[PDB]
Nucleic acid binder design. Structure first.
Ligand SMILES: [Mg+2]
Ligand SMILES: [Mg+2]
Ligand SMILES: [Mg+2]
Ligand SMILES: [Mg+2]
Ligand SMILES: [Mg+2]
Ligand SMILES: [Mg+2]
Ligand SMILES: [Mg+2]
Ligand SMILES: [Mg+2]
Ligand SMILES: [Mg+2]
Ligand SMILES: [Mg+2]
Ligand SMILES: [Mg+2]
Ligand SMILES: [Mg+2]
Ligand SMILES: [Mg+2]
Ligand SMILES: [Mg+2]
Ligand SMILES: [Mg+2]
Ligand SMILES: [Mg+2]
Ligand SMILES: [Mg+2]
Ligand SMILES: [Mg+2]
Ligand SMILES: [Mg+2]
Ligand SMILES: [Mg+2]
Ligand SMILES: [Mg+2]
Ligand SMILES: [Mg+2]
Ligand SMILES: [Mg+2]
Ligand SMILES: [Mg+2]
Lengths: 123, 208, 123
RNA sequence: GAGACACGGUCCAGACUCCUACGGGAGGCAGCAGUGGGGAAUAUUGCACAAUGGGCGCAAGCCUGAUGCAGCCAUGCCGCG
RNA sequence: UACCCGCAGAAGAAGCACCGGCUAACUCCGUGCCAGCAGCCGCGGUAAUACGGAGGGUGCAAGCGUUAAUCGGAAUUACUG
């Protein structure tokens, strides 16, 4: 459950701390983006010396949500906040070099194996 | 067939520099006609005394121009005593030759004009709330738009909008010549007094 | 001038500054040959004088003077500056060393070669 | 333990660098050499503890890379060419 | 190993700066307010000991010019003064 105007935290060290979602990609009249979905973001406030600066328009991937993710056995894993990892607008690869917090295996694919490897713990 | 526009200027120099400019212009024209290229005179603003020209602009039309020009472009020096002051000591007088730039002046196409019909924003009456005689001629490359609503006949409104677009683009075509003459002007103070490519000594005016 | 006055406020020493401040405690301050030109001296001299513009490592900018006869320097290059002031070239406080991170020696000089960086012409 | 709240001793937190089955672990040259970087600029990954004496022990022994010192350099200075 | 004793040969080692005045030391040939500039005063625009080369002198030398840089000369923060 991530819409436009939704405010997310940042789960890597690209330099940004808060981002705001401005588009859900991949369909017409799309409402929500879950874990593993790409979104378009803008940076709202960042550290003074980082790889990204405030006000830039860029891509991201959703990693952690409060809504949760269902599993085949019917279980559900929730978190206490919304987090995302910043990706390059053209190549869609992570900008930073370190991942904070746990992740899930909904990211286990050929596109986010780097994120999976860098994550300190995987649920 | 190449087109070159060159300027010969005295810089910020005295009547001796103006006289040198006149002589060098004459020799340049003679050498160009010998080399077989044609020309026309554009500006020949006069100096302050007799037979003293301040600056001149030349239009060059011919073939193999970049080889004829490269022995002239730069600084030309005349070595001789001043004829206006019989006891002055300065002996080297420098004048400058530069290569200028021209634009891509094109006649106005009408196929670039887009028309929009909308409602004239008055106060207003119930007939003007209907009328779509407001004609907007928008020029798609430049983005410049002008609106005409003077007459209630939409043909005349369209004609007036087209005429106003003509006029207003004829003020964007006119602020470019001034903008490039602001660039022609700098060449006057850009003359460097040294490293001469050509030297003329005495009144015999021998090349070197 | 009295002793009571001199004990209530002692003699003040004169502070003196340097005329080569961009050297910053160092006989040389590294810089890039941004742009190279010639200027004309003011009264009562007349010639062409060869100089070069240089960008300091701390974010400032200086101008240097090229001695000798014949210089082969261009832009996009890095040189040094030794010191020595030319007056009638208003604004020039440094001399280029003949061979300082870009430069060469004076071509076919034969005496006083140490100052103009000419290698030894050996029979 | 006498001793600071601690270089090569301990615990915790932090940034950085590594090994992992992912559960978890290791490290601190401002010791002597050395490497990368910065600079306008400064030496060789040398040896004998034979000596000093810190040190630790009754001592041998050894840290010893401080010391004795090397190899190198026009660096300051001195005397030599 | 410092050092002491034999071999050969001037060999295997003489160069650098300034130069009108301050300051020890200026003639010529090329050029022409161009090329060339310092510490200051200032040279070069057809006659230059102030530029280049030749040359010459002078003085130094494992060093000269420039700063980072100091003190002095500066009685120019002066108690001595
Ligand atoms: Mg008379
Ligand atoms: Mg009304
Ligand atoms: Mg109506
Ligand atoms: Mg000299
Ligand atoms: Mg104890
Ligand atoms: Mg302590
Ligand atoms: Mg301790
Ligand atoms: Mg521990
Ligand atoms: Mg250590
Ligand atoms: Mg080690
Ligand atoms: Mg070290
Ligand atoms: Mg280093
Ligand atoms: Mg370096
Ligand atoms: Mg080495
Ligand atoms: Mg020992
Ligand atoms: Mg020495
Ligand atoms: Mg002198
Ligand atoms: Mg003297
Ligand atoms: Mg000179
Ligand atoms: Mg003269
Ligand atoms: Mg002469
Ligand atoms: Mg000595
Ligand atoms: Mg002093
Ligand atoms: Mg005093």
């Amino acid at each position: 459950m991530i819409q436009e105007q939704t405010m997310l935290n940042v789960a890597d060290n690209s330099g940004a701390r808060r981002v705001m979602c401005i588009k859900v990609l991949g369909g017409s009249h799309r409402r929500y983006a879950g874990v593993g979905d790409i979104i378009k973001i803008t940076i709202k406030e960042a550290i003074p010396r980082g790889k990204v600066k405030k006000g830039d328009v860029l891509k991201a991937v959703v990693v952690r949500t409060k809504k949760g993710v269902r599993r085949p056995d019917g279980s559900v894993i929730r978190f206490d906040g919304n987090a995302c990892v910043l990706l390059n607008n053209n190549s869609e690869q992570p900008i930073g070099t370190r991942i904070f917090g746990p992740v899930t295996r909904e990211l286990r694919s050929e596109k986010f194996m780097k994120i999976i490897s860098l994550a300190p713990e995987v649920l | 067939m190449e087109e070159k526009i060159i300027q010969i200027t005295a810089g910020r120099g005295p009547l001796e520099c103006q006289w040198v400019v006149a002589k060098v212009l004459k020799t340049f024209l003679q050498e160009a006609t010998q080399a077989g290229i044609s020309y026309t005179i554009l500006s020949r603003e006069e100096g302050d005394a007799n037979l003293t020209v301040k600056s001149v602009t030349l239009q060059l039309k011919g073939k193999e121009l970049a080889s004829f020009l490269k022995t002239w472009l730069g600084t030309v020096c005349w070595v001789g005593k001043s004829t206006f002051r019989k006891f002055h000591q300065r002996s080297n007088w420098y004048i400058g030759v530069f290569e200028l730039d021209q634009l891509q002046r094109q006649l106005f196409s009408e196929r670039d004009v887009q028309f929009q019909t909308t409602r004239s924003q008055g106060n207003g009456g119930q007939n003007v709330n209907k009328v779509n005689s407001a004609v907007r001629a928008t020029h798609l490359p430049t983005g410049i738009s002008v609106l005409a609503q003077d007459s209630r006949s939409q043909l005349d409104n369209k004609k007036l909008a087209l005429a106003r677009l003509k006029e207003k683009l004829a003020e964007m075509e006119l602020q470019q010549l001034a903008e490039q003459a602001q660039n022609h002007w700098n060449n006057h103070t850009q003359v460097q007094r040294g490293n001469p490519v050509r030297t003329f000594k005495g009144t015999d005016f021998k090349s070197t | 001038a009295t002793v009571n006055q001199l004990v209530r406020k002692p003699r003040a020493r004169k502070v003196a500054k340097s005329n080569v401040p961009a050297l910053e405690a160092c006989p040389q301050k590294r810089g890039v040959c941004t742009r190279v030109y010639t200027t004309t001296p003011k009264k009562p001299n007349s010639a062409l004088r060869k100089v070069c513009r240089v960008r300091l490592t701390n974010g400032f900018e200086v101008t240097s003077y090229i001695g000798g006869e014949g210089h082969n320097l261009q832009e996009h290059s890095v040189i040094l500056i030794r010191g020595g002031r030319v007056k009638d070239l208003p604004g020039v406080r440094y001399h280029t060393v003949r061979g300082a991170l870009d430069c060469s020696g004076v071509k076919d000089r034969k005496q006083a070669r140490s100052k103009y960086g000419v290698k030894r012409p050996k029979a």
